[PDB]
Amino acid sequence: MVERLLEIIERSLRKCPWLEKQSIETLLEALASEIEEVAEAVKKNDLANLEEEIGDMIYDALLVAAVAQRDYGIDLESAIQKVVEKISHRKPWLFWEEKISLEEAEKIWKERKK
Amino acid sequence: VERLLEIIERSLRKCPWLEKQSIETLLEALASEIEEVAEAVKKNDLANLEEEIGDMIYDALLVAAVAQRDYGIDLESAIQKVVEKISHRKPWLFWEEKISLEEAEKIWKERKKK
Ligand SMILES: [Mg+2]
Numbered sequence: 001m002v003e004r005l006l007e008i009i010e011r012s013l014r015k016c017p018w019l020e021k022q023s024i025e026t027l028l029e030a031l032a033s034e035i036e037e038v039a040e041a042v043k044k045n046d047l048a049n050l051e052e053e054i055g056d057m058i059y060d061a062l063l064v065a066a067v068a069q070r071d072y073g074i075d076l077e078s079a080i081q082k083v084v085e086k087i088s089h090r091k092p093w094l095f096w097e098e099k100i101s102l103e104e105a106e107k108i109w110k111e112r113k114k
Numbered sequence: 115v116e117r118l119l120e121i122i123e124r125s126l127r128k129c130p131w132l133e134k135q136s137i138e139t140l141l142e143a144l145a146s147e148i149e150e151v152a153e154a155v156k157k158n159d160l161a162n163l164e165e166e167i168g169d170m171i172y173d174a175l176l177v178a179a180v181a182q183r184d185y186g187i188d189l190e191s192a193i194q195k196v197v198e199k200i201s202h203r204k205p206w207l208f209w210e211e212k213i214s215l216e217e218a219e220k221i222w223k224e225r226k227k228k
Pocket residue numbers: 030031034056060
């Protein structure tokens with residue numbers, strides 16, 4: 001439940017004395033760390049742990065978002081609506097009925113990029 | 115927030131590039147965005163930070179998407195594991211009055227044992 005997680009993150013901005021002391025840098029490293037926990041769990045086909053680390057990973061990315069807002073005034077809805085513009089623009093086939101071949105998709109993508 | 119998960123779902127459905135990506139490859143894509151974030155922070159480049167923050171949430175969520183695709187992992191249960199974990203480790207987030215760093219850590223230290 002994503003909302004529950006964003007509420008959590010809101011409560012941490014407002015209340016948490018550990019979070020107050022963390023820089024985006026530090027959080028960035030926390031995130032690179034969970035990425036490693038995820039890679040290890042995939043390696044072991046450890047499904048219960050994979051599920052744990054996926055959650056850890058999303059939380060930690062979202063804590064980087066939070067402090068980007070805290071410290072740099074980055075709005076997450078803006079940051080999100082932006083990446084959605086980019087994707088939609090680059091990969092227009094996402095909104096097209098018939099699937100298209102990898103080669104078709106790339107030729108498009110090569111051109112969108114620029 | 116939601117248009118982004120619809121986007122991701124559309125990629126699971128349609129995208130011939132995403133079919134060819136493994137969670138390892140994608141973990142690595144997230145690691146690289148994290149670098150781009152660290153960089154826009156360095157340079158107090160606000161427009162770019164907003165960019166990369168977005169890139170990072172999307173890519174993180176694409177790692178989640180392939181965890182589901184390839185390993186069966188349900189994002190709602192994964193988020194729920196992490197909501198329970200934090201609620202257990204940081205009970206102060208649901209307490210009215212604030213608490214000190216020193217207080218929060220003593221607690222966290224013990225809750226970590228469970
Ligand atoms: Mg972590």
